Design a protein around this nucleic acid. Sequence first.
DNA 1: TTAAA
DNA 2: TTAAA
RNA 3: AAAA
Lengths: 427, 419
Amino acid sequence: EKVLVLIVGTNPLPNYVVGSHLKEKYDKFVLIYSEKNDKINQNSTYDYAKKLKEHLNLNDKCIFLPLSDVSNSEKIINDLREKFPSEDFVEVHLNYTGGTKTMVVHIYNFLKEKFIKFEGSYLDARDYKLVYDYSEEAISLKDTIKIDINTLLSIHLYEDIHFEFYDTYSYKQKFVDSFDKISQEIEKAIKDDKGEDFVKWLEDPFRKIFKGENKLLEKTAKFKKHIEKLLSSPIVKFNEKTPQFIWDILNAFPEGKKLNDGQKLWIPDDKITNDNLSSRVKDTVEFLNGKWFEWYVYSQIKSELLDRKLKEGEHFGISLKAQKKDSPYFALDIFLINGYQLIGISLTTSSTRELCKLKGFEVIHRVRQIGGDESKAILITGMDKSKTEDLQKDLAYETGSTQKRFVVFGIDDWADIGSKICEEVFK
Amino acid sequence: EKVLVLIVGTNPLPNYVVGSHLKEKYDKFVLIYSEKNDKINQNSTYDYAKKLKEHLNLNDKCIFLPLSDVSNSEKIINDLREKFPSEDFVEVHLNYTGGTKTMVVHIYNFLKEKFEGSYLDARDYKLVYDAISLKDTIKIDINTLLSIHLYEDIHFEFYDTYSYKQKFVDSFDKISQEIEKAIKDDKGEDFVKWLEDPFRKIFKGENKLLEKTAKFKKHIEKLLSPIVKFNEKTPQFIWDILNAFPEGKKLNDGQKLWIPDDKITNDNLSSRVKDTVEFLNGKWFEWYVYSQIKSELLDRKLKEGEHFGISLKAQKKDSPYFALDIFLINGYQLIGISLTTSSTRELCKLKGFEVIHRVRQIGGDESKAILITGMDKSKTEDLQKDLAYETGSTQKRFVVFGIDDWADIGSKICEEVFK
DNA sequence: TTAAA
DNA sequence: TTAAA
RNA sequence: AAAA
Ligand SMILES: [Mn+2]
Ligand SMILES: [Mn+2]
Ligand SMILES: [Mn+2]
């Protein structure tokens, strides 16, 4: 009977990692967790212990040991002696990575006196190594222990998750037999260092013409009044000062979905109805105003992830959505898992500081919610390099690592965004 | 000699609190910190230990002990054997609250060979010996708190140095009193709706419209209609709020919207409009809440500028500054308050992320963030659930208030903060 | 519970 | 480094 | 997983 003992704190991922690596060598498993006590402002980590038992397949070889007070040395010592298994064990391995400082201090010494092979362990979050106290070995688990998106979100209490594959992408369904032509044309301009010029034309005249009153592109009356009120106008900027590579992008859409009417801007007559207007520009405007960039970035990384033996739908995906039980859901543009570190990618074409700054707070908090406190967040913006370096420094929080856990890319990174994501995440 | 040993992690506040309370009873102090080794992704907590020595006035009775690897047991014990003071100490007290788990285990065991251990419970605000409540015993100011978290250039305003008191001098008290009456009479929801329509449809068209008369006159023409709703369907209490403003800073020409003639220059427009629009668009709500909180804390022991203030801004060295609407310190816990008048879920969610992260940066991982919005009760509850994060405690660290709380917001903040 | 403004 | 949109 |  070889027993492995884990300390269940509020970060379940370290215990899942050590469990996945050591279960093959032990016969019994003791999960020490906290009880809920409102009077001392103590919540319970029991939900994580069940998820640890579930996703490690411990079954009845798992012993749950609750602690009444995780900050009282006496109660911890007492609760251990009363509830710790008294069977004669040959080996006792305690990984003291989780829990409070009082938990690790007193559990360790209680099991250092009671015992018989003994070994203390700790998983390093910085360099991904399992350090043994007496064996003096530091084995890396970075490339060996794996985890998929379902397991990772589940042990963090997130259920009902869905996402899109490369083949089931939403705008492929909307632009059948055109999507590849539209996406190949955009990609070529972005790889031709036209990203900056695109986002300027997108701000003016594009967003001046095709944005404003809600349902502007679905009621011809609203769109009629808007173009009249645009009669210095963005229409001439579009008609007369639109560069050629955008004309190539605009003409990549099918004629029935082109924003242009030749080499000028399509304006509906009084014959064109509400549904006619919507069927022409709605999907094309929504794709050009931002959705295209989600697909572009995902397309520039899928090959590099498959080369590293990652599997789509388990280790990367697009348009992920998840939620806790009976709680609102959230959306994440792209997700990636390197070994067992979550990387969440949030995308925007905006170049405006305030908007991107708020995007940064968002992606930081979401990856902590679903991947634990060692996740990495990447924000990709249309800002210049000075603005992106400013944002990283603005939002950086110090956890004890030299490597950044919040990364901002900008408009100068778009043309080679594949390799830059690859270097940031895996190197 | 009686020596106190602290473990310097990346949260310096528990070490300040434990240090403030136990400095009196001890002679020497050992601060065990981490070296910087980029090759193992390990950064140094030396900057925090220096701040601990400075703001606790440890002077030369403080000994910095570095560790080359805070993740490796043997490398720790070695650096502990070769560096820890071998002088004869009659009493040794190790507080193992900070640092990594390896640090607290092997430093504890090292010192036990040569003894008392203590720990500061973040959940019940007590120091526990291997239990004294410090919640109302140890105090800190905004300057000390941000400084130990490495922030500098801290500035903020007082009730009497509020910026808009200098922009509407001889009229701010009437303006603020008018707005407060409307919110005290449960008209917050009505006010919010009128700001969304037609106020922000007229005065928030695009960029720098309130600065260029050409841009403003153009926007007026396209509207000609929210100008009609403004002139005709504006509630009486809102006309009273508008007419409380100085005449050269009024948005209304009599009982109708003012329209600049070609004569009005860019300086004449902005001086008449820009300050008034920005205050009504939402800055008023910052002042309203602050005035209510300063009222409720009139009996408590907090001093303005040490434990609460408005419009806090600070920065790290060579780093961008942030802005925080209101700050409060209860004992040694930072309470950050972000205010918005918006009723929109998307906008209020993004403000929630912001205030959760900011208070964590400047006040440590045990800070409390409060977001005050103009949403209804169902949306505020949904937002609290959406953004909640498990900390180990049963009391919430992210709190959202909505439009129904505006009238009694002073009592609401007092009850949430002081428990 | 679009994306950007 | 507006607060809203 | 460096006041769970
Ligand atoms: Mn699976
Ligand atoms: Mn996005
Ligand atoms: Mn605010």
